[PDB]
Design a protein around this motif. Structure first.
Motif, PDB file in Angstrom:
ATOM      1  N   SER A  27       0.867  -1.180   0.000  1.00 13.33           N
ATOM      2  CA  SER A  27       0.000   0.000   0.000  1.00 13.33           C
ATOM      3  C   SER A  27       0.910   1.240   0.000  1.00 13.33           C
ATOM      4  CB  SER A  27      -0.918   0.009   1.242  1.00 13.33           C
ATOM      5  OG  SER A  27      -0.200  -0.179   2.416  1.00 13.33           O
ATOM      6  N   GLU A  28       0.312   2.424   0.023  1.00 10.03           N
ATOM      7  CA  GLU A  28       1.057   3.676   0.016  1.00 10.03           C
ATOM      8  C   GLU A  28       1.988   3.774   1.171  1.00 10.03           C
ATOM      9  OE1 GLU A  28      -2.280   3.237  -0.030  1.00 10.03           O
ATOM     10  OE2 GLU A  28      -3.079   4.462  -1.714  1.00 10.03           O
ATOM     11  N   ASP A  29       3.167   4.337   0.921  1.00  8.99           N
ATOM     12  CA  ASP A  29       4.152   4.551   1.992  1.00  8.99           C
ATOM     13  C   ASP A  29       3.987   6.062   2.265  1.00  8.99           C
ATOM     14  OD1 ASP A  29       6.493   5.411   3.380  1.00  8.99           O
ATOM     15  OD2 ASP A  29       7.579   3.652   2.635  1.00  8.99           O
ATOM     16  N   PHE A  64      -0.434  -1.873 -13.093  1.00 14.07           N
ATOM     17  CA  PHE A  64      -1.353  -0.805 -12.714  1.00 14.07           C
ATOM     18  C   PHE A  64      -1.369  -0.503 -11.249  1.00 14.07           C
ATOM     19  CE2 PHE A  64      -2.611   0.532 -16.780  1.00 14.07           C
ATOM     20  CZ  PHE A  64      -2.789  -0.595 -17.590  1.00 14.07           C
ATOM     21  N   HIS A  65      -0.797  -1.385 -10.423  1.00  9.79           N
ATOM     22  CA  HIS A  65      -0.633  -1.078  -9.001  1.00  9.79           C
ATOM     23  C   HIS A  65       0.443   0.038  -8.881  1.00  9.79           C
ATOM     24  CE1 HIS A  65      -0.238  -1.498  -4.700  1.00  9.79           C
ATOM     25  NE2 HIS A  65       0.961  -2.067  -4.768  1.00  9.79           N
ATOM     26  N   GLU A  66       1.541  -0.058  -9.629  1.00  8.23           N
ATOM     27  CA  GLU A  66       2.552   1.004  -9.649  1.00  8.23           C
ATOM     28  C   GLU A  66       1.930   2.280 -10.176  1.00  8.23           C
ATOM     29  OE1 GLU A  66       5.929  -0.488 -11.814  1.00  8.23           O
ATOM     30  OE2 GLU A  66       6.708  -1.583 -10.063  1.00  8.23           O
ATOM     31  N   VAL A  67       1.108   2.159 -11.230  1.00  7.80           N
ATOM     32  CA  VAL A  67       0.441   3.400 -11.768  1.00  7.80           C
ATOM     33  C   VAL A  67      -0.392   4.062 -10.670  1.00  7.80           C
ATOM     34  CG1 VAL A  67      -1.154   4.293 -13.473  1.00  7.80           C
ATOM     35  CG2 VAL A  67       0.454   2.548 -14.155  1.00  7.80           C
ATOM     36  N   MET A  68      -1.178   3.263  -9.926  1.00  2.82           N
ATOM     37  CA  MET A  68      -1.995   3.809  -8.829  1.00  2.82           C
ATOM     38  C   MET A  68      -1.137   4.451  -7.785  1.00  2.82           C
ATOM     39  SD  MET A  68      -5.256   3.641  -9.384  1.00  2.82           S
ATOM     40  CE  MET A  68      -5.786   3.988  -7.698  1.00  2.82           C
ATOM     41  N   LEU A  69      -0.043   3.771  -7.361  1.00  7.03           N
ATOM     42  CA  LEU A  69       0.831   4.378  -6.346  1.00  7.03           C
ATOM     43  C   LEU A  69       1.375   5.741  -6.831  1.00  7.03           C
ATOM     44  CD1 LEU A  69       2.726   1.224  -5.252  1.00  7.03           C
ATOM     45  CD2 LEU A  69       1.118   2.501  -3.776  1.00  7.03           C
ATOM     46  N   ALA A  70       1.741   5.824  -8.106  1.00  5.17           N
ATOM     47  CA  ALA A  70       2.239   7.086  -8.655  1.00  5.17           C
ATOM     48  C   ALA A  70       1.154   8.161  -8.765  1.00  5.17           C
ATOM     49  CB  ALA A  70       2.846   6.792 -10.052  1.00  5.17           C
ATOM     50  N   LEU A  71      -0.066   7.767  -9.147  1.00  7.10           N
ATOM     51  CA  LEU A  71      -1.164   8.744  -9.177  1.00  7.10           C
ATOM     52  C   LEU A  71      -1.456   9.213  -7.758  1.00  7.10           C
ATOM     53  CD1 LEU A  71      -3.496   6.806 -11.693  1.00  7.10           C
ATOM     54  CD2 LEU A  71      -2.310   9.071 -12.159  1.00  7.10           C
ATOM     55  N   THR A  72      -1.302   8.344  -6.741  1.00  4.58           N
ATOM     56  CA  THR A  72      -1.525   8.793  -5.369  1.00  4.58           C
ATOM     57  C   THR A  72      -0.434   9.793  -4.969  1.00  4.58           C
ATOM     58  OG1 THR A  72      -2.876   6.942  -4.836  1.00  4.58           O
ATOM     59  CG2 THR A  72      -1.841   8.110  -2.998  1.00  4.58           C
ATOM     60  N   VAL A  73       0.836   9.544  -5.358  1.00  2.00           N
ATOM     61  CA  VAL A  73       1.917  10.500  -5.103  1.00  2.00           C
ATOM     62  C   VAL A  73       1.509  11.809  -5.739  1.00  2.00           C
ATOM     63  CG1 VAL A  73       4.268  11.195  -5.773  1.00  2.00           C
ATOM     64  CG2 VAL A  73       3.807   8.873  -4.844  1.00  2.00           C
ATOM     65  N   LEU A  74       1.059  11.819  -6.991  1.00  2.75           N
ATOM     66  CA  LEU A  74       0.629  13.075  -7.656  1.00  2.75           C
ATOM     67  C   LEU A  74      -0.498  13.795  -6.929  1.00  2.75           C
ATOM     68  CD1 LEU A  74       1.740  14.282 -10.303  1.00  2.75           C
ATOM     69  CD2 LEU A  74       0.018  12.730 -11.396  1.00  2.75           C
ATOM     70  N   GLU A  75      -1.511  13.017  -6.544  1.00  4.67           N
ATOM     71  CA  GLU A  75      -2.664  13.556  -5.811  1.00  4.67           C
ATOM     72  C   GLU A  75      -2.183  14.238  -4.522  1.00  4.67           C
ATOM     73  OE1 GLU A  75      -5.170  10.662  -3.990  1.00  4.67           O
ATOM     74  OE2 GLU A  75      -6.913  11.981  -3.924  1.00  4.67           O
ATOM     75  N   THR A  76      -1.313  13.547  -3.798  1.00  2.00           N
ATOM     76  CA  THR A  76      -0.762  14.035  -2.549  1.00  2.00           C
ATOM     77  C   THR A  76       0.040  15.314  -2.771  1.00  2.00           C
ATOM     78  OG1 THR A  76      -0.717  11.725  -1.774  1.00  2.00           O
ATOM     79  CG2 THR A  76       0.619  13.362  -0.516  1.00  2.00           C
TER      80      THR A  76
END
Length: 153
Positions: A27-29, A64-76
């Motif tokens: 999950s997100e770090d 797509f799990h890596e894509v999601m983690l990166a989109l969460t970094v962007l969102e954050t």
């Protein structure tokens, strides 16, 4: 020119974004995600360096799990960083190349990624509409809706 040769994951913030979006994560770090925001806020090169690393992880990636983690970094980073970062992330080229191209039919991502991207485009357009130098994302948002794309909320 765009003929850049330095590995996006080698810069100071790029090293943290690489670890924060590695597919082995469960999950997100959040410690790394916030450290990434600090580097963007506090250092001259952090904003542009961060966008190159995020684009490297997302573009052409079928994990797509890596894509999601990166989109969460962007969102954050948009929520926890300032205008210096917003001016770069709202640009037409960044939004088209990293967000729109991720959801075009050709790329065929899963629903969780489609929805995450729609939410970023719409939330950023809503937050940035009032700023004359953050129009790239607003223009893409209105054009996608005009073309027939459905958004949530």
């Amino acid at each position: 020119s765009d003929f850049l040769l330095g590995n996006p994951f080698s810069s100071p913030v790029g090293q943290r974004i690489e670890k924060a979006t590695d597919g082995s994560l469960q999950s997100e770090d959040w410690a790394l995600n916030m450290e990434i925001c600090d580097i963007i806020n506090e250092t001259e090169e952090g904003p542009k360096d961060a966008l190159r690393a995020v684009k490297k992880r997302i573009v052409g990636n079928k994990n797509f799990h890596e894509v999601m983690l990166a989109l969460t970094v962007l969102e954050t980073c948009v929520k926890n960083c300032g205008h210096r970062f917003h001016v770069l992330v709202a640009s037409q080229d960044f939004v088209e190349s990293v967000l729109v191209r991720t959801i075009l039919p050709k790329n065929n991502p899963p629903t969780i990624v489609h929805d995450k991207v729609l939410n970023l485009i719409q939330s950023w357009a809503d937050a940035f509409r009032s700023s004359p130098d953050l129009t790239g994302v607003v223009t893409i948002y209105e054009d996608l809706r005009r073309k027939g794309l459905e958004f949530p909320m």
